[PDB]
Amino acid sequence: MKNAFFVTASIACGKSTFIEIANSLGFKSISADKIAHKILDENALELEKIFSPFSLKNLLKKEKKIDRKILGEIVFNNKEAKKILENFTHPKIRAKILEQMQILDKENKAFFVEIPLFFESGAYENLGKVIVIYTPKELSLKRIMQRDKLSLEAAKARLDSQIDIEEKLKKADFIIKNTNSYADFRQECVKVIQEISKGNM
Amino acid sequence: AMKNAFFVTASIACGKSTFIEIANSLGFKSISADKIAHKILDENALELEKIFSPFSLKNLLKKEKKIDRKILGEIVFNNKEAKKILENFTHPKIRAKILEQMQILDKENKAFFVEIPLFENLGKVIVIYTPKELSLKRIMQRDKLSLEAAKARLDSQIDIEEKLKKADFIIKNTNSYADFRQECVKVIQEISKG
Amino acid sequence: AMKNAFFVTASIACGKSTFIEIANSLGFKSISADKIAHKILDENALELEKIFSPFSLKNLLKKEKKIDRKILGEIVFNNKEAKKILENFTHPKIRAKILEQMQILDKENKAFFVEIPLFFESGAYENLGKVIVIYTPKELSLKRIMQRDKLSLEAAKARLDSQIDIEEKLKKADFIIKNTNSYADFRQECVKVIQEISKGNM
Amino acid sequence: AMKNAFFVTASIACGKSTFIEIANSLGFKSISADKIAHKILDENALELEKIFSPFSLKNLLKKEKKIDRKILGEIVFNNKEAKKILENFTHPKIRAKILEQMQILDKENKAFFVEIPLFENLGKVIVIYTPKELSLKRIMQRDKLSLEAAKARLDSQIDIEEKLKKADFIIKNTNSYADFRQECVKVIQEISKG
């Protein structure tokens, strides 16, 4: 598809701000996150059957709404549980996303799919062009311990993620740098959408 | 080995917990991997807020610096990197905590029971056993599951069968609950004389 | 992207090599993924010695800028860090050399076959061309594997898991050649498909 | 739990082997993860050929029904599935033998050294330390590695650094070999009485 523009981001707030802006300028946005969530609610009753032997704490919260707090404990506690939920959810997530992305490509106006950087349900780099809002960060262990004031284990944790973020840029189509002030980052999203808006991208 | 340590594994969840509750009610101490993990997350709540606050636009602390396990589960759900980053931070701490806790209890010269993490030469083994045709087809059609989901479940079933081999005690989690309950006490009684 | 490219992969090794023996005889070009892979280790023999020598007291280099593949495999089997480095070292080199030799034969405008191990690593090759899986169905029953194949629980588990994974991989094949019956019958089928391809009919 | 168990881990491989050699010459036994694994492979050669014969046209067994470890690396190299199957089958048996062995030597009431597997609240920790500017940038240029490769290396470096915190013996891997050796012997004498 041709009007498909994923928007993902090294920091979660970049993701959303660009989405706030594209919206006002008369463009439409799908939220991969809202979709995934929607999935868990529509299959409540099968989810309870599948996951209930894993706990005594009931999975259904009310009238066919799934207890997410409980489900996330179950998968965190239980590697079998974790693989079953993954495989149960991937096809459904993939399928819904891909459904709505054909609803709008045909509508022939550029559209944006807002999606977390390491979202699992497929390899979406095929479907459209990817926009990654990247904030480059220090990859030095010591400087993060001193900066954000952390133990080694927590700095390890933070550093491994920033290193894994930078790798993902090899998969991007458009990178918007986000190293300067809020209002300044803002205009750059504005500029980009415009270029998309006249077939320049 | 480690003298008084007993690991409990069950085919179904509610077997385990029935055993461990009964053992508790008869004065025996137990360690819960799930509960260890839970305290680890609160014990590290602030660290986690900084590691994981760029992933979401929601506050990861709920009130009085405790961690929101709803939100952490959301940030983690369907995210390869957040799963990995959390696992790698927490799993080490969980392992150590367990081992630390095993050693203490062992020094009290009374049998105690460790619920094996679902994230052993070290002690003796009790498996709470519920027979099952170890069959991918049965699992798929009974439980209504895909191919790879069923294999996850099947591999857990095979893991228990493996343990049946050198189990020091096997407790059949039969169709009669009340029976199975008294199958537990007799084991615990036999454990207590040694 | 390439029209003349066919991946040949198999649920068991002889399935793949027979379809290739027959494809060659019928005059079509094949490249081997594992051969290309093996040659990457030798072309980068000096750099690998530097990177991996700190994991062993032994020598990686066997003779004249050649890699002792026995030792290197012991290193990566014994060391998680070595394994990841090797994977990241080789993957892009394998990927560009495979994609080097497939753009040669695609413009050469005759059908060709990339022999490849079913779970090969160095990229997602499904998007480059068409995938031919030679499949031999199996009973996904633990107990029937211990009997027939005379194995312990543990080894049966391994065998069963791999079979399950194999079936998973078909969800991404374009063309599945069954392989349940005799040798002879399997060979005929290869020829029927290679022909159907030969006409550009497939 | 095991009073006599000492775990050795080093920043570079040769620090670890020097120290173990010196400890072996002074009469202290040692457990090699790498050797245990080696023995598991030969122990299970028959089953391994049956698991792995569908991956390769080659013979996986040598004369004297020994495993062919060249051929098994060829089948596993760049094959995600063969790796997983091999790791899943062997790793448990390796871990069990490590502990089975640890427990036997600890009954001899003599200090012994466990070479930590590179594929620890059960004993004491000896870290054989070679300081390093724990920087990804330095690792990529000093070692000629890409982003993810240097990451794997860096991560290993941080794991050594995590164990500096509570280690019982830290031995600097100086720039003199000779003295580093002397650093080893004092430690081992230190350990020999207490």
Side-chain angles (χ1 to χ4, degrees):
Chain A
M1 298 173 260
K2 257 294 188 148
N3 275 220
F5 285 89
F6 296 103
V7 183
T8 188
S10 83
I11 173 167
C13 71
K15 218 156 60 67
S16 39
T17 296
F18 182 106
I19 271 304
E20 167 198 2
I21 289 170
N23 282 340
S24 82
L25 273 57
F27 296 90
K28 338 188 86 169
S29 65
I30 301 169
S31 185
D33 280 328
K34 293 275 176 266
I35 283 172
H37 188 190
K38 226 277 183 183
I39 290 315
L40 303 177
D41 287 328
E42 294 197 58
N43 313 267
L45 288 188
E46 278 312 286
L47 282 177
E48 180 282 316
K49 284 160 176 205
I50 297 161
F51 284 99
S52 53
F54 289 119
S55 91
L56 313 159
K57 299 193 268 216
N58 193 321
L59 263 311
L60 294 179
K61 180 165 213 151
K62 204 206 200 205
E63 197 185 88
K64 317 186 193 161
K65 200 174 192 177
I66 194 85
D67 219 326
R68 282 143 89 233
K69 197 217 200 206
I70 296 190
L71 181 47
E73 289 164 357
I74 287 179
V75 293
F76 171 68
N77 296 334
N78 190 303
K79 188 182 177 176
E80 179 203 335
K82 161 203 168 275
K83 286 164 164 308
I84 294 168
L85 183 66
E86 294 181 332
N87 292 292
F88 187 91
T89 50
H90 292 335
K92 296 181 189 62
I93 289 164
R94 184 212 323 184
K96 169 101 96 178
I97 277 171
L98 172 57
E99 188 169 24
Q100 303 200 340
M101 284 179 65
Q102 285 160 348
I103 291 180
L104 273 31
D105 181 42
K106 299 285 185 178
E107 165 157 3
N108 261 313
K109 196 187 186 174
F111 66 96
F112 296 106
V113 175
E114 179 183 36
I115 183 178
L117 191 31
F118 306 87
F119 207 75
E120 282 164 342
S121 58
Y124 293 124
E125 307 102 43
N126 323 316
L127 304 192
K129 277 82 139 297
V130 174
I131 303 181
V132 176
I133 310 153
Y134 177 58
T135 314
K137 289 279 285 92
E138 187 90 298
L139 302 184
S140 196
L141 193 63
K142 270 52 182 62
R143 286 273 203 179
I144 296 169
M145 278 164 94
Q146 302 195 46
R147 270 187 69 247
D148 318 76
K149 303 197 178 69
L150 307 148
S151 48
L152 282 167
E153 308 87 48
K156 160 116 161 177
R158 190 151 183 180
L159 183 55
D160 290 338
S161 44
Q162 278 152 32
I163 292 166
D164 289 329
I165 281 184
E166 293 192 19
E167 262 267 329
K168 270 248 139 144
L169 293 180
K170 302 186 180 182
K171 295 206 187 276
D173 283 297
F174 310 103
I175 298 155
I176 309 171
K177 207 145 167 182
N178 185 31
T179 50
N180 218 288
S181 64
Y182 183 133
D184 182 281
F185 163 56
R186 220 165 180 193
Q187 182 212 109
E188 185 53 41
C189 297
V190 185
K191 184 196 168 180
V192 162
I193 294 155
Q194 312 214 272
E195 312 298 321
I196 295 171
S197 311
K198 61 173 61 171
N200 217 47
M201 261 158 118
Chain B
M2 198 179 331
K3 311 165 179 194
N4 306 278
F6 284 90
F7 299 88
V8 190
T9 72
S11 324
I12 186 168
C14 71
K16 220 224 323 105
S17 69
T18 287
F19 178 91
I20 295 288
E21 165 248 312
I22 288 179
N24 291 334
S25 92
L26 285 74
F28 298 88
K29 285 189 170 178
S30 70
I31 300 159
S32 177
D34 290 354
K35 260 63 122 180
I36 294 280
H38 198 131
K39 299 167 52 154
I40 290 281
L41 286 189
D42 302 325
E43 282 183 55
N44 286 282
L46 240 66
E47 299 256 281
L48 293 174
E49 195 262 340
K50 289 160 191 160
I51 294 156
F52 291 98
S53 70
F55 286 86
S56 156
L57 329 114
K58 231 290 189 172
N59 226 329
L60 257 148
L61 319 132
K62 187 166 202 167
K63 251 206 154 166
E64 70 220 69
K65 333 221 88 178
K66 288 292 139 79
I67 207 82
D68 200 308
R69 315 217 299 167
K70 165 156 188 164
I71 296 167
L72 188 60
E74 290 177 1
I75 295 181
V76 158
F77 172 56
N78 213 65
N79 189 314
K80 187 195 78 188
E81 187 71 11
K83 276 181 205 174
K84 189 220 308 222
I85 292 299
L86 190 47
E87 285 162 357
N88 292 353
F89 184 68
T90 47
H91 288 3
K93 309 182 167 207
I94 301 180
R95 274 164 207 137
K97 231 311 206 277
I98 293 168
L99 292 186
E100 183 212 293
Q101 280 293 326
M102 275 175 65
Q103 294 193 347
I104 288 159
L105 271 50
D106 190 43
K107 288 166 192 169
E108 306 180 1
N109 290 315
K110 184 170 189 182
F112 65 95
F113 300 85
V114 175
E115 303 174 45
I116 71 165
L118 296 178
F119 315 94
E120 298 142 334
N121 266 95
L122 293 163
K124 322 257 203 80
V125 175
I126 308 173
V127 342
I128 308 292
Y129 179 53
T130 303
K132 252 163 273 181
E133 274 251 347
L134 292 147
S135 172
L136 185 83
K137 182 212 185 179
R138 253 49 165 175
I139 300 155
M140 292 180 63
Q141 71 198 42
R142 292 227 153 208
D143 298 8
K144 279 186 153 144
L145 285 176
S146 66
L147 191 56
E148 287 294 338
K151 159 178 161 280
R153 182 154 288 178
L154 186 53
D155 284 323
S156 300
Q157 294 176 15
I158 295 158
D159 275 349
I160 288 174
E161 218 67 16
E162 254 138 333
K163 273 155 211 208
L164 285 169
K165 299 187 170 202
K166 281 182 174 195
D168 304 75
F169 299 84
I170 297 161
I171 299 165
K172 291 176 215 155
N173 185 104
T174 167
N175 256 311
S176 167
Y177 188 56
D179 282 3
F180 160 59
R181 270 204 153 244
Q182 303 171 70
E183 259 166 285
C184 298
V185 305
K186 61 180 189 63
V187 167
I188 297 158
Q189 277 160 9
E190 286 180 317
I191 295 186
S192 77
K193 64 185 60 178
Chain C
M2 292 179 273
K3 297 188 191 168
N4 288 265
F6 292 89
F7 294 96
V8 177
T9 173
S11 93
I12 171 165
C14 73
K16 195 173 52 155
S17 56
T18 285
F19 181 103
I20 290 292
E21 166 49 63
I22 292 154
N24 280 166
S25 62
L26 296 191
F28 293 86
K29 301 277 206 170
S30 70
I31 64 193
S32 174
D34 285 2
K35 293 275 187 258
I36 292 161
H38 175 201
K39 224 262 164 273
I40 284 317
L41 302 186
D42 287 304
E43 286 171 52
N44 295 284
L46 286 184
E47 264 302 324
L48 288 159
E49 196 274 336
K50 275 139 186 166
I51 302 172
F52 288 96
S53 64
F55 290 100
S56 174
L57 298 182
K58 306 307 166 280
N59 203 300
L60 273 162
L61 304 183
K62 195 147 84 185
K63 186 188 149 172
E64 285 184 29
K65 284 172 263 192
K66 250 179 141 148
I67 271 276
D68 207 332
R69 268 141 74 243
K70 196 173 165 185
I71 297 174
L72 176 73
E74 292 176 2
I75 285 179
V76 290
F77 176 74
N78 300 331
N79 197 288
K80 203 169 177 175
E81 183 207 319
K83 199 211 310 178
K84 289 186 189 194
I85 291 171
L86 196 63
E87 290 161 359
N88 173 78
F89 193 75
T90 51
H91 289 172
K93 286 164 184 86
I94 306 165
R95 177 90 187 167
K97 184 136 273 226
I98 281 174
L99 179 151
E100 168 190 304
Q101 295 181 13
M102 287 177 73
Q103 274 167 2
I104 278 171
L105 312 177
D106 187 62
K107 308 298 171 159
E108 208 176 300
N109 272 306
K110 192 201 161 162
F112 69 99
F113 296 101
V114 181
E115 167 166 18
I116 187 173
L118 183 54
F119 300 88
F120 205 59
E121 281 190 350
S122 296
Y125 298 96
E126 324 104 49
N127 321 108
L128 310 189
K130 264 134 192 153
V131 197
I132 292 176
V133 183
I134 304 159
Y135 182 42
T136 313
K138 292 289 189 178
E139 223 194 24
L140 305 181
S141 169
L142 184 61
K143 329 289 203 142
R144 291 298 223 86
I145 294 170
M146 288 160 76
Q147 296 169 359
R148 169 92 201 284
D149 305 342
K150 252 87 191 174
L151 313 147
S152 52
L153 256 160
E154 297 84 46
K157 193 210 178 233
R159 201 164 218 198
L160 187 45
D161 283 331
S162 54
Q163 294 169 19
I164 300 167
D165 297 335
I166 285 162
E167 290 202 342
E168 250 297 306
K169 218 60 143 127
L170 300 179
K171 311 215 165 168
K172 286 171 269 176
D174 306 294
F175 310 130
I176 304 184
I177 295 179
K178 230 51 131 273
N179 184 22
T180 297
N181 207 280
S182 69
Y183 236 122
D185 193 64
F186 167 55
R187 311 198 190 222
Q188 202 206 244
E189 183 60 45
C190 295
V191 184
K192 176 192 167 200
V193 158
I194 289 163
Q195 285 189 300
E196 287 278 61
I197 279 170
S198 189
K199 307 179 180 229
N201 227 29
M202 272 205 150
Chain D
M2 288 182 269
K3 60 195 164 163
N4 300 113
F6 285 95
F7 285 111
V8 183
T9 193
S11 320
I12 193 180
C14 79
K16 178 169 73 52
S17 35
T18 284
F19 177 93
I20 297 298
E21 167 254 298
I22 282 162
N24 298 124
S25 74
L26 295 180
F28 309 83
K29 286 193 173 159
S30 87
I31 303 182
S32 175
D34 294 343
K35 207 227 180 189
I36 298 288
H38 194 319
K39 235 145 91 152
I40 294 293
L41 284 174
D42 297 327
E43 274 179 58
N44 294 266
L46 298 190
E47 313 222 294
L48 284 181
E49 82 84 20
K50 274 158 203 172
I51 299 142
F52 287 97
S53 66
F55 292 92
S56 164
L57 311 81
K58 295 278 217 131
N59 206 76
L60 195 48
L61 285 171
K62 292 193 277 215
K63 284 193 194 179
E64 298 254 82
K65 288 190 152 184
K66 244 276 292 179
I67 195 73
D68 200 349
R69 293 164 79 220
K70 198 172 185 198
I71 294 188
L72 185 60
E74 294 178 355
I75 294 171
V76 144
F77 169 57
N78 216 54
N79 198 300
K80 186 190 186 211
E81 175 74 14
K83 286 176 206 184
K84 165 216 252 158
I85 295 315
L86 179 53
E87 292 168 4
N88 287 152
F89 182 79
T90 58
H91 288 14
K93 294 187 180 181
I94 297 172
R95 288 181 217 258
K97 196 80 177 203
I98 283 174
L99 302 172
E100 171 181 350
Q101 277 310 307
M102 277 178 72
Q103 282 177 14
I104 293 164
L105 310 191
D106 185 64
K107 281 172 175 195
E108 307 177 22
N109 299 325
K110 194 174 193 183
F112 69 94
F113 301 97
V114 181
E115 293 178 65
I116 72 124
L118 287 175
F119 50 87
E120 311 191 9
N121 323 60
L122 277 161
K124 307 192 192 172
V125 181
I126 303 178
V127 189
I128 296 182
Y129 185 49
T130 306
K132 291 166 275 184
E133 258 98 37
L134 296 191
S135 167
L136 195 73
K137 197 180 170 181
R138 215 118 278 167
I139 287 163
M140 284 171 72
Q141 57 215 56
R142 195 187 181 271
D143 292 0
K144 310 305 198 203
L145 304 174
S146 81
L147 208 43
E148 287 296 330
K151 172 139 162 261
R153 190 153 276 176
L154 183 45
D155 282 333
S156 288
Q157 304 186 347
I158 295 165
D159 290 333
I160 295 290
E161 200 86 351
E162 286 179 344
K163 292 174 171 181
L164 277 188
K165 301 188 167 202
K166 273 187 161 182
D168 305 70
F169 300 88
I170 300 167
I171 292 153
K172 266 177 268 268
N173 194 351
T174 71
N175 257 311
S176 164
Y177 191 54
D179 285 15
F180 164 43
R181 302 187 55 95
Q182 289 178 28
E183 272 190 274
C184 293
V185 297
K186 56 167 177 48
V187 167
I188 298 151
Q189 290 167 340
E190 234 312 283
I191 291 172
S192 70
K193 305 210 277 176

Short mmCIF file of all heavy atoms in Angstrom, two decimals, chain B residues 125-144:
data_model
loop_
_atom_site.label_atom_id
_atom_site.label_comp_id
_atom_site.label_asym_id
_atom_site.label_seq_id
_atom_site.Cartn_x
_atom_site.Cartn_y
_atom_site.Cartn_z
N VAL B 125 12.13 -34.25 45.15
CA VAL B 125 11.11 -33.76 44.23
C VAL B 125 9.76 -34.40 44.49
O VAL B 125 9.67 -35.59 44.60
CB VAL B 125 11.55 -33.96 42.76
CG1 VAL B 125 10.45 -33.57 41.79
CG2 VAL B 125 12.81 -33.16 42.47
N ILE B 126 8.72 -33.59 44.58
CA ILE B 126 7.35 -34.09 44.62
C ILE B 126 6.67 -33.55 43.38
O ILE B 126 6.71 -32.34 43.14
CB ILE B 126 6.62 -33.56 45.85
CG1 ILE B 126 7.46 -33.84 47.10
CG2 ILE B 126 5.24 -34.18 45.98
CD1 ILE B 126 6.91 -33.21 48.32
N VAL B 127 6.05 -34.43 42.58
CA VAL B 127 5.23 -33.96 41.47
C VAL B 127 3.78 -34.38 41.72
O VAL B 127 3.49 -35.50 42.13
CB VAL B 127 5.73 -34.42 40.06
CG1 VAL B 127 7.18 -34.88 40.08
CG2 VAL B 127 4.83 -35.49 39.45
N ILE B 128 2.88 -33.43 41.47
CA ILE B 128 1.46 -33.60 41.71
C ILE B 128 0.93 -33.86 40.34
O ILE B 128 0.85 -32.95 39.52
CB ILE B 128 0.81 -32.34 42.32
CG1 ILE B 128 1.59 -31.88 43.56
CG2 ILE B 128 -0.65 -32.61 42.69
CD1 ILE B 128 1.50 -32.83 44.74
N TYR B 129 0.60 -35.12 40.11
CA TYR B 129 0.56 -35.70 38.78
C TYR B 129 -0.86 -35.97 38.34
O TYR B 129 -1.63 -36.61 39.06
CB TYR B 129 1.33 -37.01 38.82
CG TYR B 129 1.39 -37.79 37.54
CD1 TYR B 129 1.82 -37.19 36.36
CD2 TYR B 129 1.06 -39.15 37.51
CE1 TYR B 129 1.90 -37.90 35.19
CE2 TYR B 129 1.14 -39.88 36.34
CZ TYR B 129 1.56 -39.25 35.18
OH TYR B 129 1.65 -39.97 33.99
N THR B 130 -1.20 -35.47 37.15
CA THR B 130 -2.49 -35.69 36.55
C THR B 130 -2.26 -36.26 35.16
O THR B 130 -1.90 -35.53 34.24
CB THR B 130 -3.27 -34.37 36.47
OG1 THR B 130 -3.38 -33.81 37.79
CG2 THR B 130 -4.67 -34.58 35.85
N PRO B 131 -2.43 -37.58 34.99
CA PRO B 131 -2.13 -38.20 33.70
C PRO B 131 -2.79 -37.48 32.53
O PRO B 131 -3.86 -36.87 32.69
CB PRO B 131 -2.70 -39.62 33.84
CG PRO B 131 -2.64 -39.90 35.30
CD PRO B 131 -2.85 -38.57 36.00
N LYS B 132 -2.14 -37.55 31.37
CA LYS B 132 -2.61 -36.91 30.14
C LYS B 132 -1.95 -37.57 28.92
O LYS B 132 -0.73 -37.58 28.79
CB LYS B 132 -2.30 -35.41 30.15
CG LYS B 132 -3.52 -34.50 30.35
CD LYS B 132 -3.11 -33.09 30.76
CE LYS B 132 -2.95 -32.95 32.28
NZ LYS B 132 -2.59 -31.57 32.69
N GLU B 133 -2.76 -38.15 28.04
CA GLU B 133 -2.28 -38.56 26.73
C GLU B 133 -1.45 -37.41 26.20
O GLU B 133 -1.97 -36.33 25.89
CB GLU B 133 -3.45 -38.87 25.77
CG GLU B 133 -4.00 -40.30 25.85
CD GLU B 133 -3.67 -41.18 24.64
OE1 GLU B 133 -3.22 -40.65 23.60
OE2 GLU B 133 -3.88 -42.41 24.72
N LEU B 134 -0.14 -37.61 26.16
CA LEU B 134 0.76 -36.57 25.71
C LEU B 134 0.62 -36.49 24.21
O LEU B 134 1.37 -37.12 23.46
CB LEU B 134 2.20 -36.86 26.14
CG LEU B 134 2.36 -36.77 27.66
CD1 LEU B 134 3.39 -37.75 28.21
CD2 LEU B 134 2.71 -35.34 28.05
N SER B 135 -0.38 -35.71 23.79
CA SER B 135 -0.77 -35.66 22.39
C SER B 135 -1.12 -34.26 21.99
O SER B 135 -2.06 -33.66 22.54
CB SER B 135 -1.96 -36.61 22.14
OG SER B 135 -2.49 -36.45 20.84
N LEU B 136 -0.38 -33.76 21.01
CA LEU B 136 -0.63 -32.47 20.39
C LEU B 136 -2.07 -32.32 19.85
O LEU B 136 -2.64 -31.24 19.97
CB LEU B 136 0.38 -32.22 19.28
CG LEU B 136 0.29 -30.83 18.64
CD1 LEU B 136 1.02 -29.75 19.43
CD2 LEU B 136 0.84 -30.88 17.23
N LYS B 137 -2.63 -33.37 19.28
CA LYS B 137 -3.99 -33.36 18.72
C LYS B 137 -5.01 -33.18 19.83
O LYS B 137 -5.93 -32.38 19.71
CB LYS B 137 -4.31 -34.66 17.93
CG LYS B 137 -5.71 -34.72 17.27
CD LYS B 137 -6.30 -36.14 17.20
CE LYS B 137 -7.64 -36.20 16.44
NZ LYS B 137 -8.28 -37.55 16.31
N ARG B 138 -4.88 -33.96 20.90
CA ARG B 138 -5.80 -33.89 22.00
C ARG B 138 -5.83 -32.45 22.53
O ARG B 138 -6.89 -31.86 22.69
CB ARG B 138 -5.45 -34.91 23.10
CG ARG B 138 -6.38 -36.13 23.21
CD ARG B 138 -6.67 -36.86 21.88
NE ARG B 138 -7.25 -38.21 22.07
CZ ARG B 138 -7.69 -39.03 21.09
NH1 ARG B 138 -7.64 -38.67 19.81
NH2 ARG B 138 -8.20 -40.22 21.41
N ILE B 139 -4.64 -31.86 22.73
CA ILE B 139 -4.56 -30.52 23.30
C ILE B 139 -5.20 -29.50 22.37
O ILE B 139 -5.94 -28.60 22.82
CB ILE B 139 -3.10 -30.11 23.56
CG1 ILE B 139 -2.43 -31.08 24.53
CG2 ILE B 139 -3.03 -28.67 24.08
CD1 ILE B 139 -0.94 -31.11 24.36
N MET B 140 -4.92 -29.62 21.08
CA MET B 140 -5.46 -28.66 20.12
C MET B 140 -6.98 -28.68 20.18
O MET B 140 -7.60 -27.62 20.31
CB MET B 140 -4.96 -28.88 18.70
CG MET B 140 -3.49 -28.55 18.67
SD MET B 140 -2.79 -28.81 16.86
CE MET B 140 -3.82 -27.50 15.83
N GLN B 141 -7.58 -29.86 20.15
CA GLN B 141 -9.03 -29.95 19.98
C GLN B 141 -9.80 -29.79 21.28
O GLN B 141 -10.89 -29.22 21.26
CB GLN B 141 -9.44 -31.24 19.23
CG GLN B 141 -9.28 -32.55 20.00
CD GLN B 141 -9.27 -33.78 19.09
OE1 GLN B 141 -8.65 -33.78 18.03
NE2 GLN B 141 -9.97 -34.83 19.50
N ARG B 142 -9.24 -30.28 22.38
CA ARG B 142 -9.82 -30.05 23.70
C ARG B 142 -9.82 -28.56 24.05
O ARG B 142 -10.87 -27.95 24.22
CB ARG B 142 -9.04 -30.82 24.79
CG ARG B 142 -9.19 -32.34 24.71
CD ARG B 142 -9.48 -33.00 26.06
NE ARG B 142 -10.23 -34.24 25.85
CZ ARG B 142 -11.08 -34.81 26.70
NH1 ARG B 142 -11.34 -34.26 27.89
NH2 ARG B 142 -11.70 -35.93 26.36
N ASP B 143 -8.62 -27.97 24.12
CA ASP B 143 -8.42 -26.64 24.65
C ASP B 143 -8.62 -25.54 23.62
O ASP B 143 -8.43 -24.37 23.93
CB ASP B 143 -7.00 -26.52 25.18
CG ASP B 143 -6.72 -27.47 26.32
OD1 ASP B 143 -7.56 -28.34 26.62
OD2 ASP B 143 -5.64 -27.33 26.92
N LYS B 144 -8.94 -25.91 22.38
CA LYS B 144 -9.09 -24.96 21.30
C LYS B 144 -7.92 -24.04 21.14
O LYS B 144 -8.05 -22.87 21.44
CB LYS B 144 -10.37 -24.14 21.48
CG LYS B 144 -11.59 -24.89 20.99
CD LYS B 144 -12.88 -24.08 21.01
CE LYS B 144 -13.84 -24.63 19.94
NZ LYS B 144 -15.28 -24.59 20.34
#
